[PDB]
Every structure is written in structure tokens, then in C-alpha cells.
């Protein structure tokens, strides 16, 4: 299979290893109690949290003493969140393990070096969102993504479009081993009998443009939300073939192992940015 090494980054169950819609793939101890915690290894481009029935953006700092505020780290002294890329690099100037890091990886590490509730003996590391609007890293105090039985749900929105949801486990080489941009004139397929064949079982949903297809794939993507139980480990409807000519979004839950050179298709993943195309 000549596509093995190129298609490795679309093996989401391996290169990500956790839920995408809802990432709660690990547990950690904080003052005795065990809590759930995002643990995906790839950035989730275009992901945010919608505060159902609220005009408060989810990157607003949490209520400092619930409806009033959002999910972000409250103001502190010195200020840790939000922190610009220039501020982060200067803050960790003397740290050797930051010099070759990138803006997204640095944000995840910076969020991960924050102590949870005065328990220094805890592997609980807060998630974060990096905003390319102004190159600011927002540490997230609330690491929950969905509550719609204060009601909120995750999604991809035109407003969440410069965001990137970052677990504590984002790899410093996400640039090579993770999906970011969608593929022009390419369709996901399965290598069968020495030739790339179509995906055998997909669900076709109308989608006016690429953004809607990516939003759908995200909604059906792997979800660790309660219904080590309720951990997807990256399994789900994470992939999508978007037919630009027919405006059809073809979603499936099997890892693709090759690409079909079709000029009417754009290949997308739940992790991928909803708009960017190579």
C-alpha cells in the first residue's frame, strides 16, 4: 500500500486517541477526587463551546463569585490567561524546552503548567483554546464540553473559526502527524486489491458548502460524553467526503487507507479546519 505513510495522520483513532466532539479520554486526581480531562493528541481546529441561551462567549472568564461568565481561566496575578504568544515566549525565555515549540504547542504546555486547586501532586492539566484573532492563549478553567440535558454544547461556528481546542497532550509535531487542512480534488477510499476503492458504507447528508460538511462530521465524531467507561479512544464518524458539485457530505466511521483523485470532492476530518483547503 503506497498510501500507508501519507494516510497515517488520518488514522484518528491512533494519532488522536480520544474524543473529538467531546474529549474526556483521561482521568486525574485533584485533592482525592477523580475528574475527567481532555487528552486528545491533535488540535481540534474550529472547535468552541456554545452557551445555549446566553450572549456570553465561552472564552469569558468563569464567574468569580455561573451564568454571568464563561469557561476561561479567571484573572490572576501575575496574569496567566489570556497570554499572547510574545508574552508566552518571553515568560518561558529561560526554559530550554520552549525554544523549538510552536504557538499551539506552547499554549497547551502553558495551560498544562497551571496547578489545579493547590494539588501539586496531580496530573490534571487544564485544556486551552488558542485564538489566531490576536495570538492569545486562553486557559480553560471549565474542561467540560457538553451539558444539554447552565446548558452548553460544542460545535463549529463562523465565530469559533480562529479557535483551536487543545488538550494537555497535543504533540509538538502536530504540524506533520495531525490533520489540519482539507484536501482539494481528493476523496477518502479503502485500499482493496491493489487499487483505491470507494468507502463501502457512508451516510450522505446535504451540505451547502464545505463548512456545513465539516460541522456535520464534527457533530457525529467521537464523543466521550457520558450516556473508564464512555471513552471513545478516537472511534467514531470522524471522516467526510464532501461532493462540491452535488453539495453532499458523505460521512463514515472507518479509517481511510488511500485517496481517490476525484475533482468534485474535498476530503475533511472532524479535526480539520472547516474552511482551510490546501
Amino acid at each position: 500500500n503506497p498510501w500507508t505513510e501519507y494516510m497515517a495522520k488520518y488514522d484518528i483513532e491512533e494519532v488522536h486517541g480520544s474524543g473529538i466532539r467531546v474529549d474526556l479520554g483521561e482521568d486525574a486526581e485533584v485533592a482525592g477526587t477523580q475528574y475527567r480531562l481532555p487528552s486528545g493528541k491533535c488540535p481540534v481546529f474550529g472547535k468552541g463551546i456554545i452557551i445555549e441561551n446566553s450572549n456570553t462567549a465561552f472564552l469569558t472568564p468563569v464567574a468569580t463569585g455561573l451564568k454571568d461568565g464563561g469557561f476561561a481561566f479567571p484573572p490572576t496575578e501575575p496574569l496567566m490567561s489570556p497570554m499572547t504568544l510574545d508574552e508566552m515566549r518571553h515568560f518561558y525565555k529561560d526554559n530550554k524546552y520552549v525554544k523549538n515549540l510552536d504557538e499551539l504547542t506552547l499554549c497547551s504546555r502553558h495551560a498544562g503548567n497551571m496547578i489545579p486547586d493547590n494539588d501539586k501532586n496531580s496530573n490534571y492539566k487544564y485544556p486551552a483554546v488558542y485564538d489566531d484573532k490576536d495570538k492569545k492563549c486562553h486557559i480553560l478553567y471549565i474542561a467540560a464540553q457538553e451539558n444539554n440535558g447552565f446548558c452548553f454544547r460544542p460545535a463549529k461556528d463562523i465565530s469559533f473559526q480562529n479557535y483551536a481546542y487543545l488538550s494537555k497532550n497535543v504533540v509538538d509535531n502536530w504540524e506533520k502527524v495531525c490533520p489540519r487542512k482539507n484536501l482539494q480534488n481528493a476523496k477518502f477510499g479503502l485500499w482493496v486489491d491493489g487499487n483505491c476503492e470507494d468507502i463501502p458504507h457512508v451516510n450522505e447528508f446535504p451540505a451547502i458548502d464545505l463548512f456545513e460538511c465539516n460541522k456535520l462530521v464534527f457533530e457525529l465524531s467521537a464523543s466521550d460524553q457520558p450516556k473508564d467507561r464512555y471513552k471513545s479512544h478516537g472511534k467514531g464518524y470522524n471522516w467526510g467526503n464532501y461532493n462540491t458539485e452535488t453539495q453532499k457530505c458523505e460521512i463514515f466511521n472507518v479509517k481511510p487507507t488511500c485517496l481517490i483523485n476525484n475533482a468534485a470532492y474535498i476530503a475533511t476530518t472532524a479535526l480539520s479546519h472547516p474552511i482551510e483547503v490546501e
Partner: antibody
Amino acid sequence: QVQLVQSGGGLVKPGGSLIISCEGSGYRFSDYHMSWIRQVPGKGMEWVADITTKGDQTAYADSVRGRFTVSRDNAKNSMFLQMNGLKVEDTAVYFCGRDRFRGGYNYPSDIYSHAPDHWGQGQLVTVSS
Amino acid sequence: DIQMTQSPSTLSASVGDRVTITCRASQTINNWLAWYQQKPGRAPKVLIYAASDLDSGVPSRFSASGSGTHFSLTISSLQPDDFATYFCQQYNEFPVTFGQGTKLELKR
């Protein structure tokens, strides 16, 4: 602190070529999209060209495409604008901008449009025989 | 090709006054508008990005709003330093286009 220092401005006869420089300090030069913007003296601003962080992709205004070439050498913390076949209509003050603010997307070009947060001091380029 | 139209081109006002600078686009630019201040002979200084966000260090008297085709920069209580030229930039599409500018000047 963040500084953008330019050099290379001068007088060029029409049809000639000139290279303008933009050297950045106080930050990692490789982290930022960048812009070239010219201000026709007395008039308003006019965008010239953009270059991505890695330098892979470039964007140019219609009035300069094919004549100007933007490039960057992140190892030297430097960006360049190669102007060829200059016209008198190019006479203006050329600024370089550090593009921290990301905005809209351009398909199929694969380049985002940006707004600068820091500007260079400007260099006056005069084209006249 | 988006044409930014900035009005008024000249605005005279006294210290302590509120002024607004309107900048409008021929077609939607969503929220990708930035405001700048330029003193004569000096490089521009960024004031606003995303049409409503202040850069660090900008005084709180500066503020801005807008979306789509309607944008406005407001200075609540002018100080002697604020008198300068202001221009908007649109970074939703290429080509990036600017406003021709507004010269704010003191009234004695």
C-alpha cells in the same frame, strides 16, 4: 520591545529596480505573517503584498503583481521587497507591518488576510527620471 | 474589490469632547476591521482589531463597534495627544483596502 527597522529607500529611475528591507527584533520573526503597505504622499494607504510565516505563499495587489516580489529570510530576522520595472506611479512611502491579527480566508489561494499591529518607520521610494 | 469609505475626512473638536469616525464598506467585511492612528511623519499605531477589540496599552477612552458594512471608532474624552489622523483597514479579503483617513484637529 518590538521594533521594525527598514532600509533601502532612495531614488530610482523609471524601469529600474530596488530592494527594500525590513528587519525585526524583540520577537521571534518566524511567528508572524507580514505585509508591505505604501502610503502615496498626502493620500491614503494602499496594500502592496503579503507573505506567510514560512514564506511559502505570497499575495500581491493587482497594480504590482508580476513586478514586485516579496521574500523573507527568517534566520536573519529580515523581510524583503524586490521592486522591478518601477513606474513613477510607485512613488510612495513603503511600510512593513507585523501581521498579528488574522482575519478572513482566501480560497483557493490558501492565504489569510491580516491586519498589522506594528509598523516600520517607513522608507521613501521616489521614482523619477 | 472592497472599497472602504471613511467619513468625515476632517473633524474639528475641543478637548474633552466625544467624536466618532465612520468607516463603511461596499460589501460585507464581517468583523475584520482594524483602526490605526498616524501622527505626521511617524508610523501608524494600532488601536482596534476585530472592529471592537482594543490592543494592549490603548487608553480606555478609545472604543469601536460595528459589523458587516457599518463601523465606527469613538473617542469618549479627547486629550491633546489624540489629535492626529485615523484610518480603518479591512482584512477580510484580498486586496486589503484602507480608508482615506480622517484628520482630527483641535478647536481653539
